[PDB]
Design a protein around this ligand. Sequence first.
Ligand SMILES: Nc1nc2c(ncn2[C@@H]2O[C@H](COP(=O)(O)OP(=O)(O)OP(=O)(O)O)[C@@H](O)[C@H]2O)c(=O)[nH]1
Ligand SMILES: Nc1nc2c(ncn2[C@@H]2O[C@H](COP(=O)(O)OP(=O)(O)OP(=O)(O)O)[C@@H](O)[C@H]2O)c(=O)[nH]1
Ligand SMILES: Nc1nc2c(ncn2[C@@H]2O[C@H](COP(=O)(O)OP(=O)(O)O)[C@@H](O)[C@H]2O)c(=O)[nH]1
Ligand SMILES: Nc1nc2c(ncn2[C@@H]2O[C@H](COP(=O)(O)OP(=O)(O)O)[C@@H](O)[C@H]2O)c(=O)[nH]1
Ligand SMILES: [Mg+2]
Ligand SMILES: [Mg+2]
Ligand SMILES: [Zn+2]
Ligand SMILES: [Zn+2]
Ligand SMILES: [Zn+2]
Lengths: 43, 23, 430, 430, 47, 48, 442, 442
Amino acid sequence: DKYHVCECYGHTQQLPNYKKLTNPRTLQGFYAKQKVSACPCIP
Amino acid sequence: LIDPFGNPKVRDVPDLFGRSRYS
Amino acid sequence: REIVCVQAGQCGNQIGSKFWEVISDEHGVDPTGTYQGDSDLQLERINVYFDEATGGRYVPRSVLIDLEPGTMDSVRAGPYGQIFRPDNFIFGQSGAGNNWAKGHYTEGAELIDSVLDVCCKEAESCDCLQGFQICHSLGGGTGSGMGTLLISKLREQYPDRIMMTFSIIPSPKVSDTVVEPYNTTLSVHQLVENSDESMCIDNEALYDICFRTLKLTTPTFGDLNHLVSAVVSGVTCCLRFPGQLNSDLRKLAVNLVPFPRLHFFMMGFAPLTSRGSQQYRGLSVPELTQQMFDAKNMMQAADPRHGRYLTASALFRGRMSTKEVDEQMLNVQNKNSSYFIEWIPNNIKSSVCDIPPKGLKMAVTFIGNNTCIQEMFRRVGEQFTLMFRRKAFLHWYTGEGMDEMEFTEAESNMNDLVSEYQQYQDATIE
Amino acid sequence: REIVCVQAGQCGNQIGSKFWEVISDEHGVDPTGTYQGDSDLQLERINVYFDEATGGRYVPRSVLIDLEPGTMDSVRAGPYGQIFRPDNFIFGQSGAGNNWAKGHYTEGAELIDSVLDVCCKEAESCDCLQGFQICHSLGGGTGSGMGTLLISKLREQYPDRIMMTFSIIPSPKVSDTVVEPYNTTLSVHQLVENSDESMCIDNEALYDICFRTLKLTTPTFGDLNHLVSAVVSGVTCCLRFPGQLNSDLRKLAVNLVPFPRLHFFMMGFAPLTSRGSQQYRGLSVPELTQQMFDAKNMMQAADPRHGRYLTASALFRGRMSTKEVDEQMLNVQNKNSSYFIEWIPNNIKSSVCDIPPKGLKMAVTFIGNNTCIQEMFRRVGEQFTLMFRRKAFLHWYTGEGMDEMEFTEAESNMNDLVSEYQQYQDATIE
Amino acid sequence: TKNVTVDATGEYLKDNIDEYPATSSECWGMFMKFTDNMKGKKLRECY
Amino acid sequence: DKEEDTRKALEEIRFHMEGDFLNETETVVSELGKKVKAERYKGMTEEQ
Amino acid sequence: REAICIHIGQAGCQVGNACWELFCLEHGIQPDGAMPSDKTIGVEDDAFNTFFSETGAGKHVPRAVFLDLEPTVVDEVRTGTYRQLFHPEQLISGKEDAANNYARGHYTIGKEIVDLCLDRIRKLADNCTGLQGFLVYHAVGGGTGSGLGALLLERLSVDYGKKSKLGYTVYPSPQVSTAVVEPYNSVLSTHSLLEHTDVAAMLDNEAIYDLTRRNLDIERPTYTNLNRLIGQVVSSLTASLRFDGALNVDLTEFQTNLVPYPRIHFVLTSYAPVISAEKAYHEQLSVSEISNAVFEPASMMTKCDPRHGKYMACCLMYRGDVVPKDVNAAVATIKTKRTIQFVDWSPTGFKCGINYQPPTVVPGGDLAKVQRAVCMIANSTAIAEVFARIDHKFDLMYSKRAFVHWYVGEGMEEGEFSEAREDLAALEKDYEEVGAESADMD
Amino acid sequence: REAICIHIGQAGCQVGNACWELFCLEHGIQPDGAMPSDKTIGVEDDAFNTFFSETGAGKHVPRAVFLDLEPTVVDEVRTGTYRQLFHPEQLISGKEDAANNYARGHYTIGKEIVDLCLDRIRKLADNCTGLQGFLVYHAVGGGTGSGLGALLLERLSVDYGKKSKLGYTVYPSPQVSTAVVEPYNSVLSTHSLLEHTDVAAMLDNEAIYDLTRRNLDIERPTYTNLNRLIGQVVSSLTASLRFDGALNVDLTEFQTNLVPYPRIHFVLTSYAPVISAEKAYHEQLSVSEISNAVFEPASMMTKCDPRHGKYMACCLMYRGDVVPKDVNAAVATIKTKRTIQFVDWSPTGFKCGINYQPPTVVPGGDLAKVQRAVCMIANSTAIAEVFARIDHKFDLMYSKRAFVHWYVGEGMEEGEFSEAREDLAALEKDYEEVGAESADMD
Ligand SMILES: Nc1nc2c(ncn2[C@@H]2O[C@H](COP(=O)(O)OP(=O)(O)OP(=O)(O)O)[C@@H](O)[C@H]2O)c(=O)[nH]1
Ligand SMILES: Nc1nc2c(ncn2[C@@H]2O[C@H](COP(=O)(O)OP(=O)(O)OP(=O)(O)O)[C@@H](O)[C@H]2O)c(=O)[nH]1
Ligand SMILES: Nc1nc2c(ncn2[C@@H]2O[C@H](COP(=O)(O)OP(=O)(O)O)[C@@H](O)[C@H]2O)c(=O)[nH]1
Ligand SMILES: Nc1nc2c(ncn2[C@@H]2O[C@H](COP(=O)(O)OP(=O)(O)O)[C@@H](O)[C@H]2O)c(=O)[nH]1
Ligand SMILES: [Mg+2]
Ligand SMILES: [Mg+2]
Ligand SMILES: [Zn+2]
Ligand SMILES: [Zn+2]
Ligand SMILES: [Zn+2]
């Protein structure tokens, strides 16, 4: 319309996908399947 | 205090101005 | 012949409190609910409005409905509030928001089942059921939406009984609510199909009654609701006391309504007179008849002088002669003949009851079916079309879920009601 | 005509304490066991529930069984606990662990012989034995497993008598334990084969009764057990007092069960009303009948409006006319004809007893056989299917020794019970 | 500034308790308290 | 007969109003019951 | 029944001190949270519940949070006279300010403090049973008020969703000014108010200074006077929930009656019997006089002249000794006036409220004691003139990239200035189009 | 009825001092073992029996052993104030430590001391008539706690068989650390904890330090504070055996309800009313408030966030003035939240317990006095993140063979490092698989 859809400013009102976000992170499950190297180390 | 028919009536609106809650 | 009452919203609960005070006073019921009367004539028809509880007590057959219990706590706290049965108070947890769509669709459907269960439980206990009586405003939110919802459900469950409503409508000069035209139009659309008889009162007319006739220095809603409770208790008097010519709600409907859509009426009560003047004029049938037809004594803003009477009814209370009633109604019809619809040979029905309200020697209540009611509907329809053409506040109603087609249907049906009144206004014998 | 009571588990022993308080009060037995009554009507049927020991004393015909002695300490601490015979308390030294297989197979077979010995000792003392009465929960561990084991053994030893159970079943909304569905499913499989008549109670219905009708500020399990003890003591009243139309447990069974698997019933007790409201309503047979059929007064989560009545029974206590009872049952059958199975010409049995419960002028207990009870079992089957597809906690039961085929067999039996009720619900004359 | 403005009248209120106005709010009664006590106790509804 | 039924109904109401079930109190208490309050616990007293 | 108050930054905390002082004196809670229960004439009532919760030992504690990035002002609240009233967790303070940068509050620093605030608001909302809105106090001229106000409002919208949020906001005055960078912060707050707020009331200190000089007799007013006036207005609007009356009005009725379209939610506020003690005993103060007073621009708390626009809706709250017949006569007389005009699509322009509780008098206060008062909030197209002057000042500075280095270095894209300025320009065009008469009908 | 406590090494003995001070003060036994001779309460209740036995002379003595390889800590217990409470045989001490080597404890040094421990446990188990489990306190970061704890659990598991063994274990924090070789000891420990424990509760000192800084107002906490909190948790779990209540819970009901599969036995623990005396007067502490508290991750005593996993079962223990209807209303409120998720195969997720005895207050303690408390133990897939951190640290340090020569010298094959690391990798995959939705029926 004549306004902006709030995807500007970097905000979104879409509710989170709880089932996807709820699964844990594991070395083989999550980290080893990344193009850029990732690790469980705290920075 | 008079009813619309002429009879006396009791108060219907509280008297609060000039009153204090705690003695 | 017993009536079940329903009181909805703030206005309905407030008017109901004064009505049940007036009814309890005439039958000698103490504010504790104990009978303390002094004649068997009081007891012999107590069943019409009260059920009997053990060891003397009487309880009133009424349902109280509201969306926040604040009003319910105010009515329970009133001087006669104790008489009401605690289980008869039905309330929700969130308000109508002064919005018709909320009251009809969201909180209405949430509470309506408990109200229908209570109304059926009260109705099926009666040995013979007479009509229901409902008090509500059309300009509000829960009153209009849930009142019309409940009226529709009761009309489905009891289509052979009578449905009677007393209703408050917005004044032509000052609004109490901005969205009044939508709520009024949708409520009138529901009532014209569902209702059997509808009476209308303007708060502006009660203010003009108090200031011009009674010269009250500081009127309050208790006075307006007392005048309304007086007329409300007067209409049913012939149902519950003896008389030379008994009358009933169905007989009033049969004599007042010529065609089923023309069921909106004006109301008046006659022996209104200031305490200073009262010493100067005794009560007599000519005095009651003259005040009864004076437009100053009518409870709507429309004036009879711009219309014509199709039918009228007068209910008299007191020990009185049949000559004064018959000859006065003939004399008034003959002298003002231009104001009466000519294709009906006699427009007035009379009824006489022996027992007057306490402290008055005589009284009459007047019910009138007049075409000047078309002016109120025309004014509401104009304000509705100005607001609807510009989508003035529609997003609230559409967000609740209403289709826009409801607004155009209700406008078309009300416009046809105005056209039908105008057509009967200009009819001729030919 | 003597009844033997069995109380199993914590819920059963606690409900039993209140049951024996109500029965001891009605016959005027002091908590020491001494008779202190004031009418022969109390003494002439005392044998039905009490045996007389020498020098005045009376002892109650009940067996208490549990796997941890904690409950014995709870019943001993109650106001009437002393009345129970010491030899009638059977207990072990370790709990059921909320596990059906442990309660049925390991400690069950260890203790069951001593319980059967006590029940036989109590049964063979009667001159003529009427049915047994058992109280237990289906969601627990020793209640479900040992209760159903004992029910099966008593059904082997006395197949021509009546077997009656009062049973508590897990709420779909509130639970104290995670493994309720397995124990419930296995228990329902045992009951449908062994029982003659089974009543089902939801704790959710008792909480809703307490909060809405009685408006108790802080209800406790003692209140729920008081409502249950009231109905339990009410069903047997016609066995032990005079009346105009006597009735018996066997006549109730003969009139309620059309086919042997359809023996699951609904419960109700009519005079329930808050202390504030009691001043507002006189007692009468229409008021009791109206509360008796209101689903708000029924002790299960399923509502009759979702099913149809095959049969119903009402037992009235008090001095009243038979005409009012018969005409009320005719009016209810005629007005709601769609909710009654049409291939049975009259579904309601009535019974009248002269002696009311202490402090009440009149009372009625209602038993109903309605197909909507299938909805409770379906919900339990849903939760079972969610856990069973993933073998969620099966290793405990398999470690006790159960084969996994047992779970599928029990599920199949419950599914067939639901199917049979659904088929009789939708049957037609053709 | 906050001292001389607000703390002074706070101390005056501490010394004198007759400055609190009386009122009437009868709309808070037993049904409101019943709704208050019954939070989270919804049972036996059909959907 | 009417007067007798009225008297019985008043006695009925008086029994319900003064009872211990609706008033949520207990009067018949055993000595062991003063220590063990398994079911009948409802809350603490004012002194506590 | 209950309402939760959110106070942000310096203006919001200082206005909060006056508000909670008034609410304590109106309900009768002593400064330490106790109550002299033994010295009483009437009876104890539940009315406090809208603003207080009890611990059970009888201490009262209020439903509010105080949010600031500098410690000093909250430490002043912690060490003052009402030290024992507030729970210490409710007073939240960070380490360093947003330095008049909206970017510093929104992106870098407020993101660290925001999660504690949201956890406290959740702990309040869990101890409620009929919450019907949030009241927010902030100024859009400063950095933390604008930036953290915007972030908190955005998070609240997703978490609580449809629940209402009503804001009282101190906007930059049209010629009195306190800081140079006010236009950037006020513009970049446009999205938050436009998309995440249900009604926003705008106040300017220059108007309250004019009202305190002309009506009251104060030659040297200070912020405590303005905050006492704001507290009186909030007490008048919230009295309808807390005390008995002839025509009650729930907070949802304001939203239903005042906003015709979802963006047109900015309202002007005014208060009638602002009068000194020496003048108050020389004059009657009838309903018609105070009704005539609320429409004069000398009575308003925002620097705008409504004669340059058209009214869409008015909501009038009367409290004290008033009779409905006099309110109707007054409103009919106002309706008769020729200098008051309503848009032709809004025929029923008024909502009325009547409450019996008269306004409270505060011991150190400057208002006189009066038996009746009226307060009005109204939606009018004249407000479009207020935005245009800020847009002109923003256009002046952004042209030369006068101070953009601070915002871009602290984390903001230069595009956000053009985005915010075009969105407020579209809001001005919306206010121009909605107010145009439908003279073309056939 | 009875439970036997086994305390190993420094952390286990120091936590034992706090536990036995609390259990003595809760029952009323004086530090010298004799109850007050003039304290005639009226009925000598049996509640002490869970933790004390009488010596026939009327003294009470506790059902515990203290195990250490260095003398200092046990000699400190022998010379302190509670010298007369313990039987001297119960305090067992060796000559020299396991020097942070799991290999030294398991193979070289613990093998000499283990038979005395078994003789003491035999003498305790013979003085029981309803023993229903062992409670074990140890840290897996040190040499003797890991090595001798594993060896002793193996021997107990062969000798006693089905009897339950419940462990309270101090695990290494993600970032705070005390010794370099912690990763090797914690990997080698986990195989034994996996095979020889029925429920294992995991603790991290960094979480209890955060809890003591945030909730209590202590700037410089020490181990005595953490040990008093652990003692409170153990007292809450064992209260169900010792005092009257509405719904009792025996330890086998705990094991039956909390463990879904025999390997899935690692649980998180939290405690609600950790509060200071000054905070206690600003807030009521109702059942629903403390129930809401146990689910916030700020309340946990292990450094894991449960929002990153799914709950399978929760066991809630309430002690004090609570009514079952309030517990049901609280649990019904928790179920509505969307940030709390249960695996779809676990529909009835809660177990409840209700006991009437309120928590005891210790004179020198830092907790306030409160009328009610709730303690929660829960099983969740979020623990896979905990194991992933230890695995990563072991991988780096082993890849180099940074310290292996110590372990090989003290008796261990280098292969044992690889075996334990693969067994932990399989447990980590089990926690990944159990949380996978059942999309097989599509
Ligand atoms: N009415 C009123 N206005 C105030 C008050 N305090 C500040 N203001 C005004 O609000 C604006 C300043 O905003 P502040 O609240 O100081 O900004 P802030 O929230 O502290 O932001 P930072 O400076 O980054 O910490 C100016 O226009 C002030 O005139 C007050 O107590 N009352
Ligand atoms: N909470 C707590 N943690 C402790 C305590 N004592 C030690 N720890 C922690 O446990 C780990 C050290 O384990 P220790 O108990 O010292 O090892 P050990 O049992 O003495 O083994 P050896 O050194 O071979 O004698 C470190 O992470 C310490 O922070 C204590 O009293 N309380
Ligand atoms: N006569 C009369 N009118 C009333 C009374 N109370 C409210 N009204 C009118 O009813 C309308 C407001 O409707 P209301 O009852 O508030 O609607 P609700 O919000 O749905 O309950 C206005 O026109 C009021 O003037 C009363 O006691 N008497
Ligand atoms: N109505 C009622 N329910 C109870 C009572 N005691 C326990 N329950 C319920 O029964 C279930 C516990 O079962 P329980 O009797 O302990 O099983 P058992 O261990 O095998 O005896 C839970 O849902 C309790 O809430 C009681 O006295 N009355
Ligand atoms: Mg600042
Ligand atoms: Mg050591
Ligand atoms: Zn955009
Ligand atoms: Zn946005
Ligand atoms: Zn790494």
